[PDB]
Design a protein around this ligand. Sequence first.
Ligand SMILES: [Cl-]
Ligand SMILES: [Cl-]
Lengths: 578, 578
Amino acid sequence: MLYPKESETREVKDLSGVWEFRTESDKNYILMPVPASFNDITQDINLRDYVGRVYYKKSFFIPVYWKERNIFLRVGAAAHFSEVYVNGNLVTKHKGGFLPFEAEISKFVNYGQENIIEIMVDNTLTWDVLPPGELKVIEDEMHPKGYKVLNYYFDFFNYSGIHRPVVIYTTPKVYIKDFSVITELSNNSALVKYSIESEGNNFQVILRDKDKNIVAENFGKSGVLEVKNPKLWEPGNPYLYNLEIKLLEKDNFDIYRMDIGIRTVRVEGKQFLINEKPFYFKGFGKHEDSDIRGKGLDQVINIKDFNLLKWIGANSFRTSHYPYSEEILFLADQYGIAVIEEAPAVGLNLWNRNEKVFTEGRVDGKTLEHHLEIMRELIARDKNHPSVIMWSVANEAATYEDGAEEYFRRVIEETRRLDPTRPITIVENTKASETKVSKYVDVICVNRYYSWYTDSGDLSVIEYQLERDLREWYELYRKPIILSEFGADAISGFHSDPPLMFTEEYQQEMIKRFVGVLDRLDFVVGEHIWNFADFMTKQSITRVVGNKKGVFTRNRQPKMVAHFLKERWSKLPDFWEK
Amino acid sequence: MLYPKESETREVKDLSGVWEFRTESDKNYILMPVPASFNDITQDINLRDYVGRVYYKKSFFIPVYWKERNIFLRVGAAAHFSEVYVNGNLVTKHKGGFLPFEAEISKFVNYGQENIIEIMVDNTLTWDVLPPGELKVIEDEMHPKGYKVLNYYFDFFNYSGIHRPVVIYTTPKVYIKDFSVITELSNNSALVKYSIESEGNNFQVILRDKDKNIVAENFGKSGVLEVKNPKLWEPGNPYLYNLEIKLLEKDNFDIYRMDIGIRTVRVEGKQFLINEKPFYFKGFGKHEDSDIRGKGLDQVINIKDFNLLKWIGANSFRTSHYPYSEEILFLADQYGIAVIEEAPAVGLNLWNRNEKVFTEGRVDGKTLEHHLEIMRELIARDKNHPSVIMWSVANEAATYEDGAEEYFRRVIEETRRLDPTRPITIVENTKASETKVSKYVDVICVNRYYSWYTDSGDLSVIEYQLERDLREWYELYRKPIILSEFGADAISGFHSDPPLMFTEEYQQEMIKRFVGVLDRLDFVVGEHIWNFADFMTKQSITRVVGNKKGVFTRNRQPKMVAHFLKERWSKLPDFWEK
Ligand SMILES: [Cl-]
Ligand SMILES: [Cl-]
């Protein structure tokens, strides 16, 4: 499914705005913005911590002239289970809170009249949705009848609601359903190879440069476009060409356009190559999180975040720990930021080797089935973005378990089959010698928190422990390694010398000592600090109103270590043969 | 008067601790620690803001064996007017809140019995005490009968109380009253020249090195001690010799010891020479200020402050804006920190050229008389500390006024007469071409706040304005220049990019741009940032609970710019021929 875009042949109507909202088995509505998480909008603590079904409702008018058009209703994201009703008719259901879903609804609309859309969203986690969790009953001596808790083991808050825009769009009855683009370098040219999915068959395809000059054209539902003297897309030079696809049939006419970038990505030895040059990742793990709206899409915050990425000198980030909005990937295309996009397989770990995760009752064949469908949906959505340069299949799963090996072999095999054009990783906090899964990926991503979660407060252990660990990863697997997470919680304004945990000084010193180690290791091709910004988590005595490891505050202002990273990364080239 | 020190011939009894305390015309006492300001000790807002007389009271016992000894009662400091009573007898009065005073009290004590000391302290400012102020009656339409305000124009809070220790000490009836030491370099030796003040006349004087080896000796009330192969005192090498003075008479025997340092100080051209090498000041304006105790002496805070000075790489500070406790100068001697010690002539300015300061009714002959007595008391107290390397006669007086010229000519002339061994400065915020006073000093000290108090928020003006200004100071006066103050208020934890006033970023960027200018000017011999730490001021819409220009918080932890200064100053030598 293609991102909804207006053209000569397609209308788009955005239903974002103020909706009516209620919780299960309640008749009274309140007002609720869309897109947004509902948790922080009100002062009702029982809604903040609500677990169950909520219902959104809105009126909309369909123009009579949309008859004899396809009418699609698209929901960008709703966490985690959703059902969509048009005038009381169920038009689609969806499982998974971080990818879009849509249905054709012309059969159910009142033309030239009022219509009602209702969207049910259920935030109840189970062990066969990603990320997983479990609702548990607690009726003991200290809890009243009916006390229940939603348990989950990922470290970000279970925000719920409609997190990305709801839109209605039209197409002709015979229309461009999808297309695939692959770019190759050939002699002094680039090739853009394409295939179009449609019931139609007569297509003209045109490629235009930045100045609207036509640089290539082809008649054909599949084909190759040759670009002589191409300008390649890469961090530091985000050149985009505009691909125009025109269906020209007897009764149907359809146009779809997308900006694409010409680049190659390849792993060879201990090098991560973009356009055949050795890349060095400088960046962050991020989160879709901001004040008040929770996980809701906000283009103000998105553009602010990319300007901060360019300001600090980052060239990349990982979409920890789930696919982000398409909007963020289009921006990464424009700004020239390399993206590792990650499936929502986070929380597959009970920090305890006595509780097994990959076992009947928890992560099983049903979870695997969902994970495989997720990879198919994710690659289908994002396969044409130049900014996505790697897929991450999971974050900190219990990869030391025997059952994790067969599980992830299947996930990894399916991902590569779906997209052979990008490398694959998995983000590990398991010990190097214990993971049964990292031997199957292209690039190793390791999260390490020496002197924070272990030997807390003792910065002196970092060089000893980190160098020994990373050398063992390389000795066992002989793959490029990204230090995919490291950092320390810092309360803005907490200062100390000597540095103490939770101060800005400790965060900067820890990060500084980690990267001094990486500079001595020629097989380390990247550093991603956790996290870009402070974000909300569930409440616990270990979380000082959320996770405070941001390099920026939640309102997008820098802590001390942001300036250290700006100075370091201004000296580090994007392409660096270590 | 010499600092009270125990020896074979002298006892010291410290009366610090818990005293009884009351305000004027009130019979009920509360408890009050000494030394401390009384303002922040209680939760009584009317005592915090009290103006008038307060009374301290304490019992003490004199041993019968102190008969036929001199018994001295010393008050380290009490702001600003004080009277001392022993068993109801007035033994001394004192004017000025930052220098010690004492009296011989054997005539008034009950030997082997209880005694009562009472100390009255008055914090009411006038135009003939330093620093000056004025109590004003405000009985208009919006103020009730009896509303009064203490107006003053210096930017630190008018803390009051007994700020330094009260002690009683004994001496023999014929005793060492004072001594003067001057050090010179001669061939490969150093000379320590001395004169002793006493009714006695037979003296043996011995000088010992760090390991208690005797390196020089002399019999004589005046004389010269030769030190072959001297180890000189300087920042980065604080070598101290111990001077022992022994009075040996028929009926009287007295010993006094003091650590001294061998160093010379001299201004020549645009150079400030210590031990004939070109010094570069790296440091701060400080304040005697800390949480809860106000201006009270606290040796924990003092030692913490010197360890921070060494940690950040500072080699100097100015005692803005008054003499500090003797304790701090003994520590500066031990740590090797160069001190510019300043008289309390601050607040001689009504930021307004229509209100004249040096005029009948304000700063006049009575103020001058007090200022001259202050310089005599200050040099008499501190003349033998190696750490004091310069006297500052005032801070930000209205030196553009005609009347300021005659006033300060007399102050400067008297200071040089009292101590020809150290250079003299005055700290200016007047425009270079307008001051009528800086032409009379040895070193120029200028306070500049471009982009803070003027063109607020615009960091881009700094290089243009500061370089032009400092070149004009040098062109007019041809003297070495210290940038004696510059900085910005920063709330700990306030961050922004781009930098905004009151953020840690703005403070660091402003300071960074100022010192980049100084590095290009070979006549600038010093940089002192305002301030070492956040300190309290009177309340106003311009003061966010005090002055927030500290590089350290009030609890002595670093802000962002502290780390910038540590890195800069670790690269700058103490002795630097620019
Ligand atoms: Cl974390
Ligand atoms: Cl100031």
